[PDB]
A paper describes a structure:
Myxopyronins are α-pyrone antibiotics produced by the terrestrial bacterium Myxococcus fulvus Mx f50 and possess antibacterial activity against Gram-positive and Gram-negative pathogens. Using in vitro assays we show that MxnB catalyzes a unique condensation reaction forming the α-pyrone ring of myxopyronins from two activated acyl chains in form of their β-keto intermediates. MxnB belongs to the thiolase superfamily of proteins that catalyzes the formation of carbon–carbon bonds via Claisen condensation. BLAST search results identified MxnB as a homolog of FabH, a β-ketoacyl-[acyl carrier protein (ACP)] synthase III (KAS III), highlighted by the presence of the archetypical cysteine–histidine–asparagine (CHN) catalytic triad.
MxnB crystals belonged to space group P1 and diffracted to 1.67 Å. The crystals contained one biological dimer in the asymmetric unit and the refined model includes residues 8–335 in chain A and 7–335 in chain B. The MxnB monomer displays the overall typical ketosynthase fold consisting of a five-layered core structure, α-β-α-β-α, similar to that of thiolase I.24 Although the sequence identity of MxnB to E. coli FabH is low (29%), pairwise alignment of the structures gives a Cα rmsd of just 1.5 Å over 254 (monomer) and 2.1 Å over 508 (dimer) residues, respectively. The active site of MxnB contains the catalytic CHN triad (C121, H264 and N292). The active site C121 is oxidized to cysteine sulfinic acid, but this modification appears to be either transient or a result of crystallization/data collection, since LC-MS analysis of the intact protein showed the expected mass for MxnB with unmodified cysteines. In MxnB the catalytic C121 is located at a crossroads between two substrate-binding tunnels. The first, canonical, tunnel (red) and the second (blue) tunnel, positioned as proposed for OleA, have amphipathic character (based on electrostatic surface potential maps generated in ccp4mg28). The position of the catalytic C121 in relation to both tunnel entrances strongly suggests that binding of substrate in the blue tunnel and its subsequent transacylation from the CP to MxnB C121 results in the obstruction of the red tunnel entrance. Therefore, we propose that binding of substrate in the red tunnel would have to precede binding in the blue tunnel. In agreement with the biochemical data, we propose that the western chain is preferentially delivered to and/or bound in the red tunnel, while the eastern chain is preferentially supplied via the blue tunnel.
Numbering used by the authors:
A (entry chain B): 7 to 335
B (entry chain A): 8 to 335
C-alpha cells in the first residue's frame, strides 16, 4: 500500500549574514579549522533582526509560488519549527499574520516534535489530505538558534545556525506518482534528559529567581544519546523498510537526513554511497527544526531530485525520537 | 459523520485550594471581587508537581477508564496550552512519566495555545480513521500559577492549574459515537491582543534586552471582543451548516473552553443554563486543561451518556475559534 501525497512546492529563507567558522575561531581562541574538523561546519547564517515568523513567511511565499498557488489557496497552515518564537500565541497564527492572511480565517496550528517537527507535520498533513478535510496545506519550519547559544561551550556555539524552509502539500493529480511507501516514528522518552532545555516553561520559568541562566541552554549527553541508537536503531530501520518490501535503499536516489551534527552524515557515509546523501550542515550548521526541510529543498532545487524518483527522509531528535519515510517525489 | 469514540477520561486536580477570599485579603482587593468580576470562587495551584506528573496522573485515569493498559496506547499526543520546558516537548516527557520511556510508543505535541485539546482530538480522529493508530492518548496539563503577574488583579486572580486527558478510539460496530460537525478558524491579526513575547527567540530569557514584562501575558480585551463581533456569527453558521438535521435543541450539553466568565455569560444569555458545563468557579482559567476538564465533568458528574449529543467549543489566543458537534 502507498499513500497519495505530493510535495507540491518548496521554499527556503536563509539570513544574509554568512558567519565563517574561521571568524568564530579567531574571536573565541579556537584553532584554525577546528569547526570544519570537529563539527563539519565551514559556515552558517545568523539573523540580524528578523523574526522567526518573518523567516517562515518568506519560505512559505516561495513554496506557495512554487506550487502554482496564491496565498488565498492555502486552507491549513502547520507551523513546525524546532523552537518557538515566543510563548503565546503559537507559530501558526504568527506566520499566518506575517503572510497577510491574518483576517482570512485559514486555520493555523503547530505540530511539535522538537527538531523533528517538520516530519511529524508532514504526517499530520498527509492524514488531513487523505481524509479530504483540507486540500492545500502549508508546512513551515523556521528556527533562530543563534540567540540562545552557550558561549561557554564551543561544541554548542559553533554548532547552530538560523534558517527556515517550507512545503506546500496536496493530493497528487492523475498521472502523478507522488506517494508515501513507508513511514515510522518511535519515541524513547527515557532519553529526555540526554538532550534537554530545562527552562522555557512552567518547570523553570524565565522570571523565577529559582531559575538559573544555565537552565535556558541546551544540555546534551552524547554518550547516552548514542546508546539509544545502539539499542533501538536497527529495529527502527527494519520496521520501516518492512513496510515496503519491493523497495530497498538501492532503489532510492537520495537520503535526506535531519543533520544536527556531522555524526549522522558520517554514519550514513559509511553505509551508503556518497552521491545519495544530501548535505547542508557544512553551510548552514544545525538549524534545528529547519534542518530536514532545508535538506529537502536542497535535494529538489540544487541536486535534481525529480518527480518519480524515490527518496528517504530520516532523523533523530530530542525526546528521543526516530523518524523515517520512504516516498516517491 | 466521522466515527470517533471518547473511550476514557481522566483528570488531575492539585491539592491546594486557593480561595479568592484569601487573594483578596493579601492583595487588597474588595471582598467578592473575584467572584463578581472573574466568576471565580477558588482555583487549584500546584505545590511540587511538574506538568508531566499531572498529565500522567490524568492519563492513567483515562487509560483505566477506557479498559486499557498503558501498553495498549499506540500514540500519545500532548496538548497543553503552555509547555513544561523548551526541550523536549510534552509528549516524550509524559511518556517517560507514565513508565513508557523505553516502549517506543510515539509521543508528540499538538499546539493551538489554549485550544490544543480540541485540535489534538481532530488530529487523533484522522489517525484513527486512516487506521494508522487505534488507541490514542490525548493529555492536557497546564501550570499557569508560576507565570502570574501580581501587578495585575485581572491576571493573577484568573488562572489555576489542572490536567485532563482522553483516550480515543474508533467505535465498535453498532456504536453511535461520532463527530457530526467540526470547524476551526484562525484570525492571526489578533495575535497581539493575547500575547506573551518571551519564551522563545524573539525575547530570549537570558538576553539583556528582555524585560520581566515580556514574560507576562498581555491582553487587549476590547480588541479580542471585536474579533468575536466580526467573525463569530459566521463561525457559528459555518459549523451548524455541516449537520442540518441537528440543532442546539438536540444537544444535551455545551462544553466550553472557559478562559473567563465572559464566555459563560454569553452562553447563558443564549442557551438554557442546564445545558452549560461550568468549571471556572472552582478551577479558574486552566488554559489547555479547561475544555477537557469540562468534558470530564460532563461525563463523570453531569451524566452525559452514550448516544447523547454535545458540543465542544472555545476561543483561544491566536486568535482561533473551535467547535464540534458529536454523539458521545
Ligand atoms: Cl471546517
Ligand atoms: Na470572597
Ligand atoms: Na493555533
Amino acid at each position: 500500500f502507498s499513500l497519495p501525497f505530493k510535495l507540491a512546492g518548496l521554499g527556503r529563507y536563509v539570513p544574509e549574514d554568512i558567519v565563517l567558522s574561521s571568524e568564530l575561531e579567531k574571536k573565541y581562541d579556537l584553532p584554525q579549522g577546528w569547526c570544519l574538523e570537529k563539527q563539519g561546519i565551514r559556515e552558517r547564517r545568523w539573523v540580524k533582526g528578523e523574526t522567526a515568523a518573518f523567516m517562515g513567511a518568506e519560505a512559505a511565499k516561495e513554496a506557495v509560488r512554487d506550487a502554482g498557488l496564491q496565498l488565498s489557496d492555502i486552507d491549513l497552515i502547520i507551523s513546525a519549527s524546532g523552537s518557538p518564537q515566543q510563548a503565546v500565541p503559537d507559530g501558526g497564527p504568527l506566520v499566518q499574520r506575517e503572510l497577510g492572511l491574518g483576517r482570512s480565517g485559514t486555520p493555523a496550528i503547530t505540530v511539535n516534535a522538537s527538531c523533528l517537527s517538520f516530519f511529524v507535520a508532514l504526517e499530520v498533513a498527509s492524514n488531513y489530505l487523505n481524509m479530504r478535510r483540507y486540500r492545500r496545506i502549508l508546512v513551515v519550519s523556521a528556527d533562530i538558534a543563534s540567540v540562545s547559544l552557550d558561549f561557554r561551550k564551543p561544541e554548542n556555539f559553533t554548532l547552530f545556525g538560523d534558517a527556515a524552509a517550507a512545503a506546500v502539500v496536496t493530493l497528487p493529480e492523475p498521472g502523478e506518482k507522488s506517494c508515501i511507501h513507508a513511514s515510522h516514528l518511535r519515541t524513547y522518552g527515557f532519553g529526555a534528559e540526554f538532550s534537554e532545555v530545562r527552562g522555557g516553561g512552567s518547570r523553570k520559568p524565565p522570571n523565577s529567581k529559582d531559575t538559573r541562566p544555565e537552565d535556558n541552554y541546551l544540555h546534551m549527553n552524547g554518550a547516552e544519546l548514542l546508546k539509544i541508537g545502539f539499542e533501538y536503531l536497527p529495529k527502527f530501520t527494519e520496521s520501516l523498510w518492512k513496510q515496503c518490501p519491493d523497495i530497498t535503499v538501492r532503489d532510492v536516489k537520495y537520503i535526506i537526513p535531519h543533520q544536527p551534527s556531522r555524526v549522522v552524515l558520517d554514519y550514513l557515509s559509511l553505509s551508503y554511497p556518497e552521491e545519495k546523501l544530501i548535505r547542508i550542515i557544512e553551510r548552514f550548521g544545525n538549524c534545528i527544526g529547519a534542518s530536514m526541510p532545508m535538506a529537502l529543498y536542497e535535494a529538489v532545487k540544487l541536486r535534481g531530485l525529480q518527480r518519480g524518483d524515490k527518496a528517504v527522509l530520516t532523523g533523530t531528535g530530542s525526546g528521543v525520537s526516530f523518524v523515517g519515510m520512504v516516498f516517491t517525489y
